[PDB]
From a paper:
Here, we report a noncanonical FAD-dependent enzyme Orf1 that adds a glycine-derived N-formimidoyl group to glycinothricin to form the antibiotic BD-12. X-ray crystallography was used to investigate this complex enzymatic process, which showed Orf1 has two substrate-binding sites that sit 13.5 Å apart unlike canonical FAD-dependent oxidoreductases. One site could accommodate glycine and the other glycinothricin or glycylthricin. The resultant product is no longer sensitive to aminoglycoside-modifying enzymes, a strategy that antibiotic-producing species employ to counter drug resistance in competing species.
Residue numbers in the entry:
A (entry chain C), C (entry chain B), D (entry chain A): 10 to 491
B (entry chain D): 12 to 491
């Protein structure tokens, strides 16, 4: 066959499906996945087209982080034409994909200085380096916000051409554009990829059927590694992906109003963030908690919903307090164990992977789609996506020392973001007594690999058995690659 | 031919008792499976009698009568449950979720409510010779509060428990069908009557159903439906929406308490409680807010307040537990604070509504009462004051209500709990008294809304206040 | 006699004493007052040489306020030579009057946006209009501060040539400079001013003695009016002066360190402010609460000490938490009932008044001294200080409406400055329910006069009898002047 | 006559001085110490005559603790006659020593359940076992208190015949009674005790003089050991006494009122406690913080004053917020390194010690005085005070394991007593991460001795040099006694 199967019906699967169908009208492109989209990140995303807004001091302090940021800047440049090309297969009545053009980043004191002050400076620096249109503005000039004075921002940063989409209208427009270009939707799940003599044959589905193909693209979010790793000798060659459980909410505003821009903070403790994405029809999206879980989870915790609502009502708009909760949304950000995406070719001919995009995969989608389509066509794709090839040794983007400083900082930030009220001696006490146990965990896990902070905290508070299983995993990966 | 309008616990309870007692007569029950604004699905629910006692309630004749009826209702529940589970099988689930209740006293609230109400509960238990014990907090199973939010006193009440409201509704429907009842899943738009007699009910699909008996148990919609009939607009007390929020939570470890865990009733009939459920679930409730217009969704504030209280005052483990569902229902909130139970001036027209925050518990007693009246009996003796066609009851002086509304307002602060400069509470007490006194005087020379409704009126639009002055004036004309 | 008696040994008394003795070597100048300085504002002041730092939006919005600011800029220009002239009468071991040259103004969210944001903008505006040397700086570049992250500043403003003095070393240097110029210190209190046929004869002291003079200058701070008002028909001709009771503290720092600049916020609720003034020898000054009292009070309340210490440890330096409290200081800022100073001549020949300087009298002292000395010598003194003649109808600088908005704003600010944690509906509730009672008090007090906000809140929470006595006072003043 | 010198003018010195002068008309008794009473615990104490009020679960669980409680009950029986005998040397105008007969113990949730709930139960148990007159009462029936509802007590306990004295009037009555019985007050400090051939010769004073005597009693509070340890080979034979630095305050109440009983909580984190002791003349005493310091400190920290005032205004009476602060008091509770007093004879003939009474020495004073005076006369004194002889190996009353559990519990209690507001996961996190570092400190300090919790926390947060000096001290004590 020259037949192509895309495994997964999130934004990444459908984006790659659309680019393949449009570029090869000769070939049959079939996309698998069910309308339920169980643990789907895409439906739970607002979503922000985050590039400059996603900048942290920590990210920009590694080579691997500066490459990710560069790819996000490149992805930003594709969004206007990509949206035009998707709305062109529909009519006015289908709804607009774009919900805002611009973003305001707010700096308030409801957080750690060591994250929020460092990250605001890093965002300003990255905007100036990339010659992006932006302005530091008076907080008084930010429309709509009505924070608690004790939670108010004292600095604000307007970013032009960094906006948001309605993730639901984007999915509808992707499906529509996929069908329009000759794509076929088969609403079942893949259970197994079949390959022999180093070549893909096709995909077994969960109804027992077998679909033949010479090209399989895996974009099954957090299930992508488990699916490819079953193939011979790949178990320790594809980096593990965990579930980044994220909570968000849809709220009908007291008066039907909403902001004209995205409103956000910089990224906060363990990739949690506060943002408000505008929506049509008197709705706003608020997000977003993040927690790496070693097993999948389909429901918000009490703590996640309380923290999200408390931050939005104090830091963005007190009017949200009396506003109607329409929906609490939960999705799994695919969380790669080495903190970097899995994009491109495998050692198996015709087998491609598009996954581990964590908290910015929706934003990257048009760039990642174009990259994989160029590779499949004999091209080189996008420069700088080379380090993120799916079949690799675990990347070490930071020293153990840098990560141990980060995990303690982020731990303390869970306190300052609450915000807590404690005796002034207690924070220094906890900083000192956290360092030892995290240093001991990092040394015990592996001599060579260190999990990034988001994952290290989940491991710190996991069962002894789960820690032991990870020591074994890290050891098997060292054997395979050294 | 009997038509019951409404498919809540009250409608179905009366439907079941009619169908079982008069196999001769044809009983049709209206209402849709969606149960829009339905209180019953959002209730835990507690079989609250002693737990529902407040100092304020026990200080009026009307309050002492309500409490006595709640004690009487408690005695019916064991046989009523047995009679409803008997029409089903093991796989249908158990209606009863706990036999006993623990009342906790903590400092996350106003002394003027929580301390007074705990004493009142203890007093009422001793007066009724009810089996109970003040116990050491250390001996309360399961709870794991924040030390700063922990209880220092606890009260075990035997034979005051809880039901799964969802399994009760399923068992009522099933028992109704089994006794010959007919479920027609549409809403009533209009009651038809002429020459002082009910003819039947127009449905929202355009149809007309004839009957010589109509029982209105449509919760918070009950008055709006009967008040359309000639000269009844100012003879049936208004019912508003007591919007209540609760939640279903899957516990971190699948565990749950063996008893109900609760505080006494708090600001504006809000309360904190945990009702056990089967299958590693717990129910937590319950906020209350009187709204002049219906509302079908929880506010952010309601969800945050409910979750914050449960995680700090009951169990910190609930913080990491999975939210399965946020529930919203309308407690039917009668403008004079008392239920609407019994006959009208229109022959064959009965009303069963305005049961606010205890209607589920009362349901078997209220059902038996209305069925006895329909059969030519006298029903239950002290339900007489609550006949639906009446002048607005005045159970409290204006002065008592103005003290209550200021106390409850201050309690919204202490229940948060707030942290403010120590001069600010006394400042707010002084500056709240004037505006509430001015509102009560402006509303009517004779009627005073109870606190729960007065705060909703205080913060409503000028037009909504003016419409209520007109309503109160028209009721004075009609009855004096 | 040509003899001069100065009644009062605060900065104003001693400053005028020094300027009289130096300008008229012919005349005998005697200065009364005890070393205890009971209710003395001067010893309790840090003190800041505030000009740009004292700017508020409210001040810059009136003609009266723009004049006060201009006088403060003029006073600033006198301080270098005035200090040189006072240190010249001493030796190396006497210590330095000047403790800092520069001031950093900090903006944090531990307060009302309606005061702190407006006042920070007003300071920046006034600096730019005057072309005064200043820089908005990164908070990270502010030396020494170590705030609680949740209480930290996000903006900072360096003002060159706006500094501080040790008020205690200034008093010692003024006494010494007074003696050096021929002055006589008589350490007793005046009980009575004696006058007949419209001329001063002298002063009865509290030891029973009588001192004759043809010139008496009253600079007795908050006691100044009570002393002159006892003279015939003057009870309702000299505006009342109340006690602005202010609390500050001297702290020995954990490590002997201190900041090189003044550190301050803009003025806050009811003229409270948060500041740290450097001192020699491992000490710092922290201030300063303000509360108008209708009766004098010589001791700090619990609330004042807790509020002062809580603000300094959270907003300036957590190290102050473990630092040793050396002294709690209480002084009476002389609070004139119409909000303007009492400077110059009376209807009684040879009777002068120098008082009602509230919260800036130390900074103004060299200008106010020179002004009164020029008037006594037949000159015109400083232009624009003529409006503040002590014998006057109560000035009305603000509409009743402006004052009622101010008092409600400042009342709400006591909450945000705490800072309080409240349900989000409660602040709007309190704003609404405060308006009525303050409007009712203003109407009941007088048809013509309105007390400024700082005094109105003290009257609101005073006894019924004290309110009634003020209605009578305001009525008697209307009779006297209309 | 034979010469006796008492070194120290606290309650213990003067109590022993009074009993010697009255009992031994043969001997000439001179008592040293200045009216300043530098670091004096006695002037800073309220003070409560604590017996049942001082009971904790920890105390009642050891033989040593049940003995201390029994001695406190015995001391209580002496107070009525002792007061009668001291007031008899004065007149009506000298003031009453006794300020209350009864005590109310309050239980609120502003603290750790593991201390406050356990201690309230232990007090109730001890009262019932002794058949002591007491009643658990309704909180509504407690006179005077007006707490913040969120900080209010939910249980209260009236104890009859457990009261309080004005420590200042007790000191004045002791001095007066000492003079009346033939005692001599020499207001200077001892610098050195002189001894040769194993016998005391006398005392060198800080004015250079030498006073001869055959009997010297050291009751210099926290200076007692430093003074005796200078004598040959005694540096490691007399257990070190550190400074239990305690802060209290005198407050003039808003309305001149006060409670008729002592109002207290049980003892809280590191022997801090909250109490109100009635005083004459519209004053109340509030206390009392406690912190073991390795060096003396004569001034309150900001933290201590804020914590004391915050607890009293919220938990006892909101009226104290607007009340006038008259005095912040600091004293050194003599804190023995092994947690037991130093009472009786040394290896040096005529050298006695009466010290290390920490937080209950004022209550014990008449019993301890009678004991030492009986020993000096050839008697046996009080049975069970013999084990507290000053020249001893450090006592080990508690396992290392018991102390490590206590220090973690008390550390957590500093949080709950604040009270803090934190995310709900944080307290369990802090409990886990505190255990290791305290266990590591205890192991490193000595193989044999473990400091009690109050001292262990001070050592944990001391300088490396101070920890090393204590390892050396503990090692030298092991050498000396094994
Ligand atoms: C959050 C919450 C918690 C509570 N907890 C408790 C508790 O623990 N214990 C307790 O005893 N009580 C509790 N209550 C109170 C109790 O739920 C109510 O008092 C009682 O259930 C009211 O019953 P009802 O049948 O009158 O009303 P509902 O349950 O509201 O039933 C009325 C029904 O009529 C239907 N309807 C409306 N209009 C029409 C129409 N035109 N035609 C046909 N049908 C119509 C509605 O859809 C609805 O299903 C609680 C209430 C709330 C809100
Ligand atoms: C804040 C606080 C509250 C307390 N509350 C209570 C309570 O309610 N009830 C209770 O029973 N106990 C209480 N105590 C404990 C009690 O105060 C002490 O146990 C007791 O006062 C110790 O008496 P003392 O005479 O040994 O020491 P101190 O009272 O310290 O007296 C020692 C004296 O010796 C002097 N001195 C020092 N060096 C020399 C020298 N070289 N020569 C001469 N004199 C010297 C000192 O200046 C001082 O005056 C409290 C303690 C504090 C600090």
């Amino acid at each position: 066959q020259t037949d192509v199967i895309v495994v997964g019906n999130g934004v990444l699967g459908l984006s790659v499906g659309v680019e393949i169908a449009r570029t090869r009208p000769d070939v049959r492109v079939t996309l698998l996945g069910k309308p339920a989209r169980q643990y789907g990140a895409t439906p739970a995303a607002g979503a922000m087209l985050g590039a400059f807004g996603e900048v942290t001091a920590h990210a920009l302090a590694s080579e691997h982080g500066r490459k990710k940021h560069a790819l996000a800047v490149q992805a930003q440049r594709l969004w206007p034409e990509w949206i035009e090309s998707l709305e062109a297969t529909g009519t006015a009545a289908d709804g607009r994909i774009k919900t805002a053009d611009d973003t305001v980043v707010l700096l308030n004191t409801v957080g750690h200085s060591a994250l929020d002050d460092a990250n605001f400076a890093a965002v300003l620096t990255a905007l100036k380096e990339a010659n992006a249109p932006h302005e530091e503005i008076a907080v008084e000039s930010v429309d709509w916000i009505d924070p608690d004075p004790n939670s108010r921002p004292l600095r604000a940063l307007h970013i032009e051409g960094e906006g948001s989409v309605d993730s639901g209208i984007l999915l509808a427009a992707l499906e529509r554009s996929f069908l329009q270009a000759g794509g076929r939707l088969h609403p079942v799940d893949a259970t197994e990829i079949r390959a022999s003599h180093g070549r893909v044959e096709g995909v077994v589905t969960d109804d027992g059927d077998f679909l033949p193909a010479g090209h399989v693209v895996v974009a099954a979010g957090a299930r992508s590694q488990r699916l490819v790793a079953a193939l011979p000798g790949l178990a320790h060659r594809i980096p593990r992906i965990y579930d980044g459980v994220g909570v968000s909410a849809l709220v009908d505003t007291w008066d039907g109003s909403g902001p004209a821009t995205v409103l956000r903070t910089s990224n906060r403790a363990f990739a949690c963030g506060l943002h408000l994405v505008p929506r049509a029809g008197g709705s706003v999206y608020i997000g977003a908690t993040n927690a790496v879980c070693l097993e999948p989870r389909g429901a918000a915790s009490i703590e996640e919903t309380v923290f999200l609502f408390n931050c939005a009502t104090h830091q963005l708009h007190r009017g949200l307090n009396g506003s109607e909760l329409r929906k609490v949304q939960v999705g799994s950000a695919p969380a790669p164990i080495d903190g970097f995406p899995l994009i491109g070719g495998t050692s198996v001919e015709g087998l491609w992977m598009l996954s581990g995009t964590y908290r910015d995969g929706l934003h990257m989608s048009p760039l990642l789609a174009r990259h994989v389509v160029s590779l499949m066509d004999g091209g080189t794709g996008v420069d700088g996506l080379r380090e993120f090839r799916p079949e690799r040794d675990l990347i070490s983007a930071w020293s153990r020392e840098e990560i141990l400083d980060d995990v303690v900082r982020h731990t303390m930030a869970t306190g300052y973001e609450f915000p807590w009220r404690l005796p002034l001696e207690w924070p220094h006490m906890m900083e000192t007594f956290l360092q030892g146990p995290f240093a001991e965990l990092a040394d015990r896990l592996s001599d060579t690999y260190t999990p990034p902070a988001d994952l290290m905290t989940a491991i710190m508070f996991s069962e002894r058995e789960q820690q032991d299983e990870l020591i074994a995993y890290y050891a098997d990966v060292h054997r395979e690659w050294h």
